Every structure is written in structure tokens, then in C-alpha cells.
């Protein structure tokens, strides 16, 4: 923890969302410093009116952002702070440009932004087995989103750390509700759960029966939205997506955790067809203004497929 970094961040001016380009679905962070990503994150909380509605003190929000960033591992090629930051930025764009904000309560928005920023906390890389030391070595197949429970645990620890309590201003009831939504939001990032619930979502939509007013359906939508944001690197402009695919590959093969480009195109096409395309199609139906995520995903499939056919 750099007291210098905190002082620096807390005293800095925070440019507008438009100046920071965070309202753009095509947003990239390659040109940004860590400080710049922290400032963008402050703007996200501010423009979603979370700072006002829940009386967050500036220094506390600043300290919390820095604690979150610090608890991601910089030696992990893809699953690091930049991934979480980008997941949060997609959530912001989906709520604003995507116009999903007016469809949710203030607590759901608050929880979704916190969850997006915290969903992969302390990730050690996909090529590194997550070991649950608190369970028997022969009985470690809970598969009940074990790593995600760990990410949530990390999130709660930071939310409760001295000087980092950004939810201090909520009443006890609001606090319990918010924690519950954050927890379900983080667990939703387990792709296994996404695949398990995909069916309902797609069916409900197929029959114009999707009712966001239904508590069960709304919870379902929040889970789908988290997945859409977690996977959004797949919708980025071509040069950015190539870079992001490169990072994932590195973490997977070169043990960027703690044959290649040649196999990447086929792999991205497969992932787009098996998981991504349908999700963004469904999201666009919920909110047409989310179309650019779908457009971006389709454009990338064609680019990767072309390379797959070897140019
Ligand atoms: Mg994850
Ligand atoms: Zn993730």
C-alpha cells in the first residue's frame, strides 16, 4: 500500500466520463496508467450516482479502489486488475449507453459495479489449480463455484477493512441486500452457472415472456449481465481483441499465470459460437442499445474465422 499513491489519487481532479471514454463499448485501457484506471473507476461510481446516494467519503472510495487493484496479481497475464477494471467499464457502458440503469434499483447497480470490480480477486491464473485447503484432499469436487466463493470472500474482506468501508452509509437492511446481490453476481461469473441457467433466459426471451419485474427473472438477468461483462473482451475492436486473446493464451500456455497464435483463431471462433454470440444476442433483445456488443462479437468471429482459414 503506497500512501503516496493514495494521496495522489485522492487529490487528483476526476475528468468527465466523456473525457475518459468510459461510456464507449469499444473502450481500451492499454494507454492508461494504473492511476488513470483508478480515476476512471471513481468516475464510474460518481456518474452512477452511487457516491451521492450512499454518501461515500472520497478518501474511503479512493482507498477501497486501491485495495481492490492491489489484491489482483500483476504476474497473472490476463486475470489481473485490468481485466476487472475492463469488466467494470463494460458494466458502466451497459448501464449508461446500454440504458440498463433505469431498469434496476440503486442497490442492484451498486452491487453490480462492486461485483464487476471484485469478481476475480486474487486469481492465480487458469493454469493454476485452485486448491481448497479447508476441505479434504479426496473431497475437493464441490465444483460449487469454489474459486468464485474465494473471490467473493476477498471482496468482503476488503469491504470490511479499516478505512475501506464504502458501504458504511447503507442501512443494515440495504447492506444485507447489497451483499447478497454482490455474492450472487460474483458466483454468476462461474461459467458453469452461466451454462446451467442459459436455457431459461433464452427460452423466456424466445416467447416474449421475459419480465424484468419478476424477482426471479431479474436475478437471472443480473447473472447474465455479469457474464456478458466478464466476457466482453470478445466484442472489442479487432486490434484490441487480438491483444486480449494473446493475453489469455499466454496465461493458459506460457503459464502467464504466475501452436499458439496458430491455434488462437480456431479457439476464439469456437468460444464465440459455443458461449458468446447467443449471450449478446439475448442481451440486445433485452436492450437494443446493447447492440454494439453483439456487433463487435460478430465482427470478431469473421476476422478470426478468416485467419483460421489461414490468409
Ligand atoms: Mg472468474
Ligand atoms: Zn473474469
Amino acid at each position: 500500500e503506497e500512501t503516496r499513491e493514495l494521496q495522489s489519487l485522492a487529490a487528483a481532479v476526476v475528468p468527465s466520463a466523456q473525457t475518459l471514454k468510459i461510456t464507449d463499448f469499444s473502450f481500451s485501457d492499454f494507454e492508461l496508467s494504473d492511476l488513470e484506471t483508478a480515476l476512471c473507476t471513481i468516475r464510474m461510481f460518481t456518474d452512477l450516482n452511487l457516491v451521492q446516494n450512499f454518501q461515500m467519503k472520497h478518501e474511503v472510495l479512493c482507498r477501497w479502489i486501491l485495495s481492490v487493484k492491489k489484491n489482483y496479481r500483476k504476474n497473472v497475464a490476463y486475470h489481473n486488475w485490468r481485466h476487472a477494471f475492463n469488466t467494470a467499464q463494460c458494466m458502466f457502458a451497459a448501464l449508461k449507453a446500454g440504458k440498463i440503469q433505469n431498469k434496476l434499483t440503486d442497490l442492484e447497480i451498486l452491487a453490480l459495479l462492486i461485483a464487476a470490480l471484485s469478481h476475480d480477486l486474487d486469481h492465480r491464473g487458469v493454469n493454476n489449480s485452485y486448491i481448497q485447503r479447508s476441505e479434504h484432499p479426496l473431497a475437493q469436487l464441490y465444483c460449487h463455484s469454489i474459486m468464485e466463493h474465494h473471490h467473493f470472500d476477498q471482496c468482503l474482506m476488503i469491504l470490511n477493512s479499516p478505512g475501506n468501508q464504502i458501504l458504511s452509509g447503507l442501512s443494515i437492511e440495504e447492506y444485507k441486500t447489497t451483499l447478497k446481490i454482490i455474492k450472487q453476481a460474483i458466483l454468476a461469473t462461474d461459467l458453469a452457472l452461466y451454462i446451467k441457467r442459459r436455457g431459461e433466459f433464452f427460452e423466456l426471451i424466445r416467447k416474449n415472456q421475459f419480465n424484468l419485474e419478476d424477482p426471479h427473472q431479474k436475478e437471472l438477468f443480473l447473472a447474465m449481465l455479469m457474464t456478458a461483462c466478464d466476457l466482453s473482451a470478445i466484442t472489442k475492436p479487432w486490434p484490441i481483441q487480438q491483444r486480449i486473446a494473446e493475453l489469455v493464451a499466454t496465461e493458459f500456455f506460457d503459464q502467464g499465470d504466475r501452436e499458439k497464435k496458430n491455434k488462437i483463431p480456431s479457439m476464439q471462433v469456437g468460444f464465440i459460437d459455443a458461449i458468446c454470440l447467443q449471450l449478446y444476442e439475448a442481451l440486445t433483445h433485452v436492450s437494443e442499445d446493447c447492440f454494439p456488443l453483439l456487433d463487435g462479437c460478430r465482427k470478431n468471429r469473421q476476422k478470426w474465422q478468416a485467419l483460421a482459414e489461414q490468409q
Side-chain angles (χ1 to χ4, degrees):
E1 298 180 62
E2 304 174 58
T3 303
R4 306 175 184 175
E5 179 172 47
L6 176 55
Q7 170 186 61
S8 181
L9 176 66
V13 180
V14 184
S16 77
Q18 173 182 24
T19 292
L20 297 178
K21 311 178 191 69
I22 59 174
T23 68
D24 304 333
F25 281 119
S26 291
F27 174 93
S28 174
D29 69 301
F30 296 137
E31 73 265 32
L32 305 179
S33 69
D34 284 351
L35 186 293
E36 289 174 299
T37 65
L39 287 174
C40 283
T41 300
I42 293 170
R43 176 56 62 196
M44 285 179 213
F45 275 88
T46 305
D47 282 22
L48 287 169
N49 210 38
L50 304 174
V51 169
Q52 173 62 34
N53 286 328
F54 304 106
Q55 299 76 51
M56 301 187 176
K57 295 179 296 299
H58 191 65
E59 190 179 74
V60 171
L61 175 60
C62 287
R63 190 173 292 104
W64 181 79
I65 292 170
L66 295 178
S67 296
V68 175
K69 175 162 68 61
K70 182 185 180 186
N71 283 277
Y72 273 95
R73 298 178 180 290
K74 69 299 181 177
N75 59 310
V76 174
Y78 183 68
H79 288 101
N80 51 47
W81 163 247
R82 296 311 178 102
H83 166 59
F85 171 63
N86 273 293
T87 301
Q89 183 281 321
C90 187
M91 183 63 72
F92 181 79
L95 294 176
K96 293 298 199 184
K99 296 174 180 168
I100 294 177
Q101 170 166 32
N102 58 52
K103 298 178 183 290
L104 314 175
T105 67
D106 296 319
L107 298 181
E108 297 177 323
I109 288 166
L110 171 63
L112 285 168
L113 181 61
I114 285 166
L117 289 167
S118 309
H119 88 282
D120 276 323
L121 279 163
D122 193 50
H123 203 295
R124 292 174 181 176
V126 299
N127 206 289
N128 283 313
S129 58
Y130 173 89
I131 187 181
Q132 186 171 42
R133 297 190 177 184
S134 54
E135 296 293 334
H136 195 283
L138 301 179
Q140 273 211 53
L141 218 161
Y142 276 95
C143 191
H144 183 299
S145 309
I146 294 184
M147 187 167 235
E148 289 72 24
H149 269 93
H150 178 65
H151 298 317
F152 171 71
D153 187 39
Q154 291 285 300
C155 176
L156 185 64
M157 294 185 91
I158 295 172
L159 282 168
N160 279 290
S161 60
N164 285 267
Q165 301 151 46
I166 54 172
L167 302 182
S168 69
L170 283 64
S171 67
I172 186 67
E173 278 300 309
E174 287 174 332
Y175 180 70
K176 288 187 292 173
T177 298
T178 301
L179 286 190
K180 173 182 181 183
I181 301 167
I182 290 168
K183 186 175 185 177
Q184 293 310 294
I186 291 185
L187 297 181
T189 63
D190 172 347
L191 205 68
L193 284 182
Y194 166 64
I195 288 166
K196 174 181 176 178
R197 300 180 81 184
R198 286 195 301 192
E200 298 182 61
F201 192 53
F202 295 163
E203 293 303 296
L204 284 168
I205 296 177
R206 184 178 318 183
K207 312 167 185 177
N208 271 181
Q209 300 185 62
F210 187 63
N211 181 188
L212 205 51
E213 302 178 307
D214 183 304
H216 173 71
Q217 284 187 48
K218 168 168 279 187
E219 180 178 351
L220 178 60
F221 175 69
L222 296 183
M224 296 297 108
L225 181 55
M226 285 294 297
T227 299
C229 296
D230 190 13
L231 303 181
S232 59
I234 204 64
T235 73
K236 299 292 171 180
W238 185 226
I240 298 163
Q241 149 66 190
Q242 288 175 260
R243 294 296 186 184
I244 299 182
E246 186 182 348
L247 286 181
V248 172
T250 294
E251 189 183 304
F252 188 60
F253 291 106
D254 319 330
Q255 183 180 297
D257 289 18
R258 205 174 189 299
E259 289 176 300
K260 289 163 189 172
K261 188 285 172 180
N262 301 292
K263 293 301 78 190
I264 295 182
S266 299
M267 300 199 89
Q268 292 304 86
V269 168
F271 186 61
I272 288 176
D273 291 346
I275 300 292
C276 312
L277 188 63
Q278 267 188 292
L279 170 54
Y280 294 110
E281 278 179 352
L283 180 54
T284 298
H285 172 291
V286 172
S287 181
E288 295 189 66
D289 298 291
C290 277
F291 173 71
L293 292 173
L294 172 57
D295 197 22
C297 181
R298 282 172 175 166
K299 286 177 177 166
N300 280 322
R301 187 202 186 278
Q302 192 187 71
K303 294 296 185 187
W304 283 124
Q305 172 61 199
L307 285 186
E309 310 176 318
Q310 296 181 59
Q311 308 180 306

